[PDB]
Each structure stands twice: as C-alpha cells, then as structure tokens.
Amino acid sequence: MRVDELRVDERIKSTLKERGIESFYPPQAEALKSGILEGKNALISIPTASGKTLIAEIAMVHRILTQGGKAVYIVPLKALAEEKFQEFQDWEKIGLRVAMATGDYDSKDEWLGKYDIIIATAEKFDSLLRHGSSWIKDVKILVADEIHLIGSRDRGATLEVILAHMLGKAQIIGLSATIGNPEELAEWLNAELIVSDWRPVKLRRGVFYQGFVTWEDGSIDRFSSWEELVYDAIRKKKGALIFVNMRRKAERVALELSKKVKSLLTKPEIRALNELADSLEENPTNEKLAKAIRGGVAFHHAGLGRDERVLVEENFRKGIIKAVVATPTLSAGINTPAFRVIIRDIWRYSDFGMERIPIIEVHQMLGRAGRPKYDEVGEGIIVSTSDDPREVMNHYIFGKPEKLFSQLSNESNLRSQVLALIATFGYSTVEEILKFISNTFYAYQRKDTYSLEEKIRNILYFLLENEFIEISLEDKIRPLSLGIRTAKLYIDPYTAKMFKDKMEEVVKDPNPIGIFHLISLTPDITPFNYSKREFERLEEEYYEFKDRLYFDDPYISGYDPYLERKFFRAFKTALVLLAWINEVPEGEIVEKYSVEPGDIYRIVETAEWLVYSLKEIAKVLGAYEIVDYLETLRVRVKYGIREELIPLMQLPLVGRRRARALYNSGFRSIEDISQARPEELLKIEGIGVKTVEAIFKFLG
C-alpha cells in the first residue's frame, strides 16, 4: 500500500514522502491496518529488513497528533538512542520536539515535560516512573523496540515491569524478532499480533562445512575455506559482515581477511581507505583498526571508542570498507546490511559454561544479509566446525525460535523492583505486591507463582533487616529514607547495602582507590577485565594500597578463581579511575593498564553515577563530613580532571585535554575567557577555530 492509502494526519504523509517513502512492504501494510492507528496494542514480529521502526514512528506521531500528549520510544541500549534521535529529527518540522533521556537516574527530568517524543532506555523510563515525573501522565503511547529482550536474563525483567506498569495506561507497541511464543506475549500485552517472514530481498540460508556450503534447499557450492565466501563477495563488488564471539578474534580475523582483500581493491578504493586509516587517533586498539582498514576490512566491537565505531559503520555503509568482522554487544550499531552474513561462531563462552547461541539471535544475524539497493539475494551462512552440518541445519534453519520466558525471578532486579513498589509506588502489604505480580508476564505463562512469592517474602526480610523498609504500627509495609533514596538512585539495594555497611570506613579514610574499588565491587557496574600476565603487577599494587581499601580480603567468600578475579577486577578498575582523574591521557591509560577506549567511556559514566549514589547514601545515613569530598570526586570522575579544572568544564567542546591547555595558558575561569581576544585562545595548542567559535558563541 502507498502512503496515500494511509488513514493518518496529512502532516505525516508529507514527512514520509519528503523522506522518499512512497509505499509500504506487505508486513508494514498488515501492521498499519491492524488497529494500531486506532489506539490498539500490537506486537509486530517481522524481519528487521522490513522496517519495524517506521511502522512505530507512524503510529506514535499519529497517536499524539490526534490525542496530543507524548510518545515514549524505548531503545534497548543507551548508545542506540542517538541514532533514533537523528532519524526522528524531521518530526521537528511538523512541530514535534524530540528529546533523548538515557541517564541521570536520580532526576524527575521535568525538563522533558515540554517535549513530544522521548527516546529512552527501559531503565531510564523505569527510573522516571519511580520519581513520578509530572509528565508521565502525558504519555499516550510507549514503543518497546526489540521487545523480545523481555526474555533476556540480564535486563528483561526491567522491560517486563515498565510494560506491566504502563499496560492499560497507554497504547503499547512492541517491535519484535521471530520467537517461539508470539501469541502468548501478545495475549499478555492485550495486543493484535502481526507475524510475518516477508523481507525485501530474498534470503538464502545455508551451512558451511569443510569446503562446502549446503543451502537449506539441498544444493551445494564449493568454497575451499569459509573466508573464500568473503573474497568471493568482494570479488563480486559486494560486501560481507562476519560475526564472531570475542573481541580479539574479531580483530585477528579482520587482519587476516584484509591481507587478501587489499589485492582485490581498485587503486582509488585503496587511497580512500588510507585517508580513513590516517584519521584514527593514535592508540593500540586504533592501531589495529587502521592497519586492517587499509586492507578494506575493519573489526567492530565495544572496545572501540564511539567515534571509531561510527567511522567503521558509516564507511561500511558507504562501501568504502568492504567487510566488517564484529562482536554481538553493539552490532546493532551497524545498521547496514551486507550481501553475505557469515556466522563464524555458534558456541559462546557462557557463565556456567559454553552454550549454543540462541536460535533467535542466529536468525537475527542471518536476517542482516541482502542490501535493498544492491542485492537481489542475501546469503546468510552458518559456519559449522565441530558440529554436524545436518544437525546445525536442522537446529538453526529448519528449527523454530525458542519461546521467551519471563526473567522476573532475577534476584537482582526483583529486590530492586520489590523495594521500588513499596518506596515509590505505595505498595504496603504482601497481598498488594502479589497483586502486581499476578499481572506480570511471568504469572501469565504459569499455572502458579508459589516460588516467586516465597522469593518475594524473603526479599522483604532482606529489606527489613537492612532497614530499607519497616512494618508500621498499622501492620503495613512502609519505606524508610534509605529505601526511598535507594529506589530513586536506581542502584540495586545490594550496592546500597554495601555502601551502608562500609560507610564508617569511607568516613575514616576518604580516598580515591578505596572508593573506586568499593563501587567497582557492586552489582551495578561491569569492571575492567585483566589477562593472566597483568595479575602479578595488579597483586603488587594491591598490597601497596591495601590499607586504603574498605573491602580488603580477596577471599571472604571462598577461593573460587571467580571470586578472587572479581576482587582484582574491581581493584584494577580503581587504578584506572585514579589515572583518569589525575588527567593521564587516554592513550597512556589504554596502554599502561591494558584497557580499551570503549570500556573507559562506559566505566567512567557508571562510576560517576555510583560515586554520586555513594554521596547520596552518605547523606541519608548522616555521614555529612564526606559529602563535599564525594561531590568533588564525582565531578573529577565525570570529566577525568583535577579539581582546579572544574570551572572550565561548562564550556562547549572543552574536555579534559582542552581544559588543561586553557588553564595552563592563563584562562582558569569563565571570567578570564570572557575578556579574551579570539587570537589569545587560538595561540593555545589544542584549541582550534571551531572551539573558539563555540566558546565565544556560548559566552555571547
């Protein structure tokens, strides 16, 4: 169907046409005519290549243009908010303001009140709901992108909860991959179900095994090695996307490929890759990237800094970079299909131990093959090495995706969610809590929820004994300041407990390493990892700074190589964080502590939040003597600077490096910068035109 067959506000039609959208794929047409334009809930389970976002965009905008109010778009990862923010930009042209809200959990963010479209993670939205932001009542529709994640252990419960809170309160639309129990999820969501396998480009799926690829139709094609699949694609002026389990494997395979790909590149292509390879800021992780890119092959994984990942994704989308070997974590950042998708690993290091990559993910990966503009057929190939090809074919290609199970039993999320109910949602009796539970997806899939109930009852004990809540004289369950504060900070009650239990120590010896180590031991952060060769040096430094730690014994819970590792991981993290506030250049940190740019950015952001949370728990506990210290530390962690640079960080385009160059040249305050001649800032090594322009604009 065409845009003009669409029964929506004409200002939407104009925007679509202006984007070059004239018609809709069959799956989209079915969805648009399912009732969502009328306010009905819906679960859209179709290929990613078939444009799920557009369907949601139309539904959201149409919803608020007719009923006014707001639309909330729930993105899976905060690093994905930006992209959505950019593509939602043209809605500003018809008077709809778009905003990104993904951090600062301890805020009502009332400033979002004047916006119409709000992009945020499930956690951020959960957080806002707890704070009771005055604009929440304004939300008419919430879109849960990659809603199948509700079945994921780590964060699925949070998505389930915000859905439970919003159901019946706003229209709910889910964008989902293919699953095993489509109707069960739709039923719980009181939604219309749209299930389709239609895609714009035919997808051919097969399994590669010892020299041959056997396609799902039974035919065979010879390829001496799996990499020939990549060379063949490039030889055909098309591209390839290779998926691997580990970061180091991603890089090693990228270099290997690039070694044979370079000789398949035109003279220009080679010079274009060079200009690109040259622009990568000096750095170990970036050194490998540049060297591989000069061959037409890049690697993609969370260790790379945002800028580097953007470069790789955009140039892959431009066909400059011919192939990309990437990991799972942020592969969603690469929004560009590829003629061929090669799944190199089908087993991944698991927690308890190795396990097969879920069928759901394998299907999502294969569904990335076939570019609409260049391909008439996309090929998704599963590489089997240790597995029987017929078994792999039967399991992944012929078999059905796994059913999604609620992950509400997660002790981490459940303790946080049970406290949140009492501390921010007014739940005061066990019966009421179980009432909320009876409306969860968890309960929906079950005949009974006896164990969860026993699990909740014990959580209440934990909260009572630890003083987050209390039983009033009325025999009701009520929160205490510690509890309310913990709920709003969004930290797990366990990390709050840790902060409370070690507060007396922090007060006695307020110091960086100890604080950074303490927070790095909490469930709310993922510390840096370390290789075996690093341990000896880590151990030495540990003894050196042992007396500054609040958690000193590496084995208070056993000798499990897992627990000793956890402790030292937190310790190494504390060391990196100290270098960070001591203004050691990123390149030097990456190099000296064997950590990656992407991880530094992530840990720094999380640390700022946790140091802030520690400051706030110190407040509720009355440990006011360390609040100023903690507040200052928080800001130092936020920017990676010494206390004296703080006054300059409010400046546009000014980071730790520029603040330093400014300060050392005599511009220490906004006042010094205010009375400066542009030439005075331009002489400073590090400050360029665009920076002075932004600074002078900022100042007037």
Structure description:
This protein is α/β, with parallel strands linked by helices and 700 residues long. It has four domains: 8-200, 3-Layer(aba) Sandwich (Rossmann fold), CATH 3.40.50; 201-398, Rossmann fold (3-Layer(aba) Sandwich), CATH 3.40.50; 410-642, Sec63 N-terminal domain-like fold (Orthogonal Bundle), CATH 1.10.3380.30; 644-700, 5' to 3' exonuclease, C-terminal subdomain (DNA polymerase, domain 1). The protein is built from 30 helices and 19 strands. The strands form four sheets. Strands 10-9-8-17-14-11-13-12 form an eight-stranded mixed beta sheet, sandwiched between helices. A seven-stranded parallel beta sheet has the order 3-4-2-5-6-1-7, sandwiched between helices. It is classed as hydrolase. The entry lists the keywords RecA fold, ATP-binding, Helicase, Hydrolase, Nucleotide-binding. It forms a monomeric assembly. Archaeal DNA helicase Hjm apo state in form 2.
TL;DR of this structure?
It contains 30 helices and 19 strands. Helix 9 runs parallel beside helix 11 (284-293), helix 19 runs antiparallel to helix 25 (597-621) and helix 20 crosses helix 25.
